[PDB]
Amino acid sequence: NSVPGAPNRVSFAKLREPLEVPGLLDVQTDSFEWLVGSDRWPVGGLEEVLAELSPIPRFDEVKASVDECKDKDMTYAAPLFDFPMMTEKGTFIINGTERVVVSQLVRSNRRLRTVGELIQNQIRVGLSRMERVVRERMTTQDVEAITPQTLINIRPVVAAIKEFFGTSQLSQFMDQNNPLSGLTHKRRLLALGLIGSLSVYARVNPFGFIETPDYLTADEEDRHVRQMVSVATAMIPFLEHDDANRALMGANMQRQAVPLVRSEAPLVGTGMELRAAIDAGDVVVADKTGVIEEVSADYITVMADDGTRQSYRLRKFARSNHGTCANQRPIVDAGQRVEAGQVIADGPCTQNGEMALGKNLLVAIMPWEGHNYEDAIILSNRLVEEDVLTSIHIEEHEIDARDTKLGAEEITRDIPNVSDEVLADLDERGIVRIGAEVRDGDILVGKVTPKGETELTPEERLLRAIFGEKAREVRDTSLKVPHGESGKVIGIRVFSREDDDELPAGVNELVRVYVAQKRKISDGDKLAGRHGNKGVIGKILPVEDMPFLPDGTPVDIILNTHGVPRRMNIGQILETHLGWVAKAGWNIDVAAGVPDWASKLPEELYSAPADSTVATPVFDGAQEGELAGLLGSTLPNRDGEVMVDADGKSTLFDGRSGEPFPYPVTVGYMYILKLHHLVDDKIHARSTGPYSMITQQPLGGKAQFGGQRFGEMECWAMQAYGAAYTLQELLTIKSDDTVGRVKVYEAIVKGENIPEPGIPESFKVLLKELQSLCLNVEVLSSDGAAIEMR
Amino acid sequence: IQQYAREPISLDQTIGDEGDSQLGDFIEDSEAVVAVDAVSFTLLQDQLQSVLETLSEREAGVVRLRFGLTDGQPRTLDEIGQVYGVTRERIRQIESKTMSKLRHPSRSQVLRDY
DNA sequence: GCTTGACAAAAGTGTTAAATTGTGCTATACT
C-alpha cells in the first residue's frame, strides 16, 4: 500500500492504515548513529566516553568495501586513533563473516540497552585498563621524556573491542537462511523469558525505553488512558483463531524455511509481506525516481530524471551462512519508469517485493491409507518434475599450504599413489576444474606434505622394485569431498603467497572450493505451514495414482485430519478455504440480495478474478461469515462446472482404484514451506572410520563417518532385556578394544566366527588415572594374584 | 619468529557450544592401525610367499635378504655374498635376472592390484 | 657360473666454523 512497486493484493481489514510502520531495521541503525556521532544523528556517545576520563576524534573512510571484506576475510572497519563499522543491513563484518549484535535488556517495567550503548560500555573497560598502565608509565621514569605515544599502548582498547564482538553472548553470527530469519535476528532482545523479539510498531526511545504509538512512554502509561505482534508473527494469516503457543511455533518455522528456485508469493497472506521484504535488505530498491537504461542478469542501471546515474550489481548464487543460495532476479524491463523506494530486483525468498517463503499447493485433508499417518505427509511426484520445491544449496571447502616443521607443504597434481582417472578432473595446479561433477571421496585440491624418515616395510619395497614405482619422499594430504556429498563446482578462490596475499604467518597458499547442488524435494525432508504444523514427507506418490478432482486435476499433497481434534490449530483450515477462493475467483450474487454477511464488507471486493492474492491482517482480517458467502460464489473451471461446494469439500477419485472416495473431502490451497534441515544432511552411517586419540572411541571428523553414541540409558535397556553379549559387544569390540575391533574386521572378511572381546581401553586408562592419584589398584587374579595389562 | 611466539591451546577446553564435548576427544590418532590394511598386508605377505615359491631356492634367499623380509634387516651386496660364499658382484647379477623374472606377467598381474 | 679391477656414488668419520644456548650482570633511591 502506498508503494510504487507494490502489486495488487486486496485487504479485508475494517480499519484504516496502521501507522508510519517504522523502518524495522532502524533500531540497529539509530543506536550506531548515536554511538558514532553521525551527522544525521546533543553530545555523541563516542564523544561522551572520553569526556568522563578527560583529563587525567575522527575516523577515516572505510578501508575496504563490504563485498571486499567478505571475500578477503577481513573486518569492515574505519581506523579511529581500526574501528568496526555497521552496514546498511545493520550488520558487522568481522574477519569476513557477517555478524549481528543483539540488544540486551537490563531492566531498571524494564529498559533495554541498544547496540550503541553496548559497544560504548565495552570501550570504558579498555580506557580504564589502558589508563591504569598510563599511571604506571608516567610514574616510572625520569620526566620530560614522556610523550603521549610512549605513555599509551592502545592494545587494551583494540583488544576489548575485538574481544567483545567475538566470545560475547550479545554478538552472534547473523542467522540467514531467508531474509526473514536475518531480519528477526536483528530486533531480537536478550536478558542475562530470557529471549524475545521486538514489537512491530515498537520504537525504542533515545535511552532505550520502548515507545508504543503519538508514541507513549512506558511510565506515561499510568498518567493517561496489532502492536503486540512481531514481524514473523504478523505474517500468519488467521492468527487470532490459532492458539498463542501455536503462533510462536509457527513464527519460528517461518525463519526456518529455505529459498526455493522459483520463490512464488503466498496466495493468502497479510499486509506485512511487502514492507517486511524490502526492509530485510536482501531486495534491490531504486534510490531515486527515474527510468532504467539497460538490464542484464549481472547489473541494472536506471537513468534518473535528475540526470544522475546509479547502478546495482546483483548477488548471483552467493552462499549464505547456512549454505542457502542468495540469488537475485531482475523484475523490471527496458524503457520502464520507476519511483523512489520501488523494487527493482527480487531477493532469494521474495516475488515482486513481498516475502515468498514457500509455495501454494492443492491440499486434501483425508487420511490416505496410513501413508500420512499421524504427522507424515504425502506429495505428488509433480513437485519433483516441476522443481516447485527444489532449492539450491552451496558448500564451501578450504585447504591451505604452509611451512612445516619438516619442510614446506606443496599442493600439486602429482599424487604419490593414484590412477590417472581420479586426477582426470584436476587442472595443472591440482585443484578441481570449474564446472566439474564431484562424488563422495573425489579430489578437490591436490596437496602434499613432507614425510620422513619413511622406513617402509620390506613387503612394501619389494613391490616397489618389482613394479619400479619409486617410493616418494612426501605423504598425501589432499582435500576430498566429504562422505555423502555431491554437486558441481561453482567457483574457486586461490590465495598465493608468491605474488601478493597477506596470508597468516606460515601459510604459503590458500584455495577455497565452492560446491552447490539442486536439491529436489525428497521423502524424509520436513515441510510446515505458518501455523506450527510440521511433518516429514512420508511418501511421494506418482501424479497418476493420486486423489484428483473431477477435472482430472491431481492434488499435490494429502494432509491427515488427526492433528485437528482439540489441538486447536483452527486457522490452518481457514487459509485452506480462502486459498481455494483466491485461486478460483468469485462473484457475489449481489444484485437485489446484497447479502447481510457482506454488509460490513468494502466495495468492489465483491468481484475478483482467478488467482488473485488476498491479505487478512492478523487481528482484523476476513471474518467468518464472509468466508462462507465467498464459497457460494466460486466460478467454474474451464468448462462451466463447480469443483468445491460451500463446505470447501469435493468428491475425489482415488487415482489407484478409480472409484470415487465415498465422502466429500475438504480440498483447498495452503501455503507451506520447505524447512531448513533435510534428509541428505541428516542421514549418517558408519562401519569403520577414524578413532579418537586420547580415548580410542570412534569419532567422525573430516569425511563425516561419525559413530552413533550408545549412552547409559541405552545400556539400561540392553541390561533390561538380558542381552549380555549384545551389550558387551557394543562397549568393547565396537568402541574401545584397540585389538578387538581390528580382529572382528579380519574375522568378518574371512567369514570366521567373531573373536572374543578384550579390555576396553577406557577401563585400562581408568587404572592409570587412579594410579596417577596415588591409589594402588591391583587386579588380583584368582591364581596369579597380580597382573599388568600390557 | 612469529611461529615460535605462538602459545598452545587447552585440550580440556570445551568447544561443544551446545553439547559439552571437550576439544580433546576430537583428535584423530593417525598412527592407529587401519583395519583393512593390516589384513590386506597379511594377504600381501601370503601372495608374496607363494610368488617366491616359483623362484629358485638360492634365488628366493637373495631377494629376501636384500629386502630383509625374513629378518627385517636389508643387507648390502657384500653381506649377502658372504653368507652364500660368493663375490658381491655376482649377488648383484642374481638380483637383476630375478627382478626380470618377477617382472614376467604371470607373477606380477596379481601384485599390481596390491 | 663366477671373479677381477677400474670407478663413481654413497655413507661414515674426524676436524672446524658457525649458530645456538645458558649464565652473569646493570651502583641515586625505591621495602
Q: Under 8 Å CB-to-CB from A466, ≥6 apart: which residues?
A: B99, B102, B103, B108, B111
Q: Radius of gyration of chain A from Cα atoms? A: 33
Residues A429 and A497 in one domain: yes
Q: Which of A665, A669, A640 has its CA nearest to residue A654? A: A665
Neighboring chain B residues of A467 at a CB cutoff of 8 Å = 108, 111-112
Whether the CB-CB separation of A344 and A338 falls below 8 Å is answered with: yes
Residues A275 and A311 in one domain: yes
- Please indicate if any CB of chain A lies within 8 Å of the CB of B5: no
Q: What is the DSSP string of A578-597?
A: HHHHHHH-EE--TTT---GG
Experimental method: X-ray
Q: Which of A342, A304, A361, A350 has its CA nearest to residue A326? A: A350
Chain A contacts in chain B segment 77-96 (CB below 8 A): none
Domain that holds residue A667: 239-267+356-389+520-568+649-678
Q: Which of A728, A753, A745, A752 has its CA nearest to residue A686? A: A745
Q: Can you read off the three cell numbers belonging to residue A408?
A: 614446506
Residues A385 and A396 in one domain: no
Residues A615 and A483 in one domain: no
Q: Which of A7, A20, A24, A67 has its CA nearest to residue A343? A: A7
Q: What is the 3-state secondary structure (H, E, C) of A690-746?
A: CEECCCCCECCCCCCCCCCCCCHHHHHHHHHHCCHHHHHHHHHCCCCCCCHHHHHHH
Residues A749 and A772 in one domain: yes
- Please indicate if any CB of chain A lies within 8 Å of the CB of B102: yes
Residues A327 and A254 in one domain: no
- Please indicate if any CB of chain A lies within 8 Å of the CB of B13: no
Sheet strands (E) in A414-506: 437-438, 443-445, 447-450, 474-476, 479-480, 487-496
Residues A733 and A777 in one domain: yes
Q: Establish how many alpha carbons lie within 13 A of residue A770's alpha carbon, considering only the half-sphere containing its beta carbon.
A: 11
- Give the length of chain A: 790
How far apart are the two ends of chain B, measured CA to CA in Å?
45
- Give the length of chain B: 114
Sheet strands (E) in A446-547: 447-450, 474-476, 479-480, 487-496, 507-519, 526-529, 534-541
Q: Can you read off the three cell numbers belonging to residue B33?
A: 592401525
Neighboring chain A residues of B103 at a CB cutoff of 8 Å = 466
Of B29, B112, B114, the CB nearest to A692: B29
Buried b (16+ CB within 10 A) or exposed e, A494-521: ebebeeeeebeebbbbbbbbbbbbebeb
CA dist A409 and A406 (Å) reads 9
Q: Which of A680, A675, A678, A681 has its CA nearest to residue A181? A: A675
CA dist A584 and A644 (Å) reads 10
Residues A541 and A582 in one domain: no
Residues A311 and A458 in one domain: no
Whether the CB-CB separation of A524 and A336 falls below 8 Å is answered with: no
Q: C28 C1' – A150 CA distance, angstroms?
A: 24
Of B24, B35, B99, the CB nearest to A466: B99
Q: Establish how many alpha carbons lie within 13 A of residue A299's alpha carbon, considering only the half-sphere containing its beta carbon.
A: 7
Residues A605 and A712 in one domain: no
CA angle A701, A704, A709 (to 5 degrees): 80
- In this complex, the answer to whether residue B93 has its CB under 7 A from any atom of chain C, a nucleic strand, is yes
Q: What is the CATH number of the domain that holds A300?
A: 2.40.50.100
Pairing type for strands A284-285 and A343-346 reads: antiparallel
CA dist A395 and A412 (Å) reads 23
Is B22 exposed, middle or buried (CB count within 10 Å of its CB: 0-12, 13-18, 19+)? middle
Residues A659 and A618 in one domain: no
CA dist B63 and A382 (Å) reads 68
- Please indicate if any CB of chain A lies within 8 Å of the CB of B27: yes
Residues A420 and A490 in one domain: yes
Q: How many helices (H) and strands (E) does chain B have?
A: 5, 0
Pairing type for strands A103-105 and A112-113 reads: antiparallel
How far does CA A29 lie from the centroid of its chain? 23
DSSP B25: G
Tell the residue number behind the cell numbers 571484506, with chain if given: A69
CA dist A11 and A622 (Å) reads 8
Handedness of CA A627, A632, A633, A638 (dihedral sign): positive
CA dist A662 and A664 (Å) reads 7
Rounded to whole angstroms, what are the CA distances from A287 to A128, A312, A344, A583, B97? 44, 10, 10, 35, 84
Whether the CB-CB separation of A607 and A588 falls below 8 Å is answered with: yes
How far does CA A524 lie from the centroid of its chain? 19
Nearest nucleotide to A141, CA against C1' atoms: C30
Interchain CB distance below 8 Å, A699 and B72 = no
Mutate to test the interface with B, among A454, A459, A749 (most CBs of B within 10 A): A459
- In this complex, the answer to whether residue B78 has its CB under 7 A from any atom of chain C, a nucleic strand, is no
Q: Can you read off the three cell numbers belonging to residue A320?
A: 549464505
Tell the residue number behind the cell numbers 572520553, with chain if given: A50
Ordered alpha helix ranges (H), A62-191:
66-72, 115-139, 148-151, 155-165, 179-185
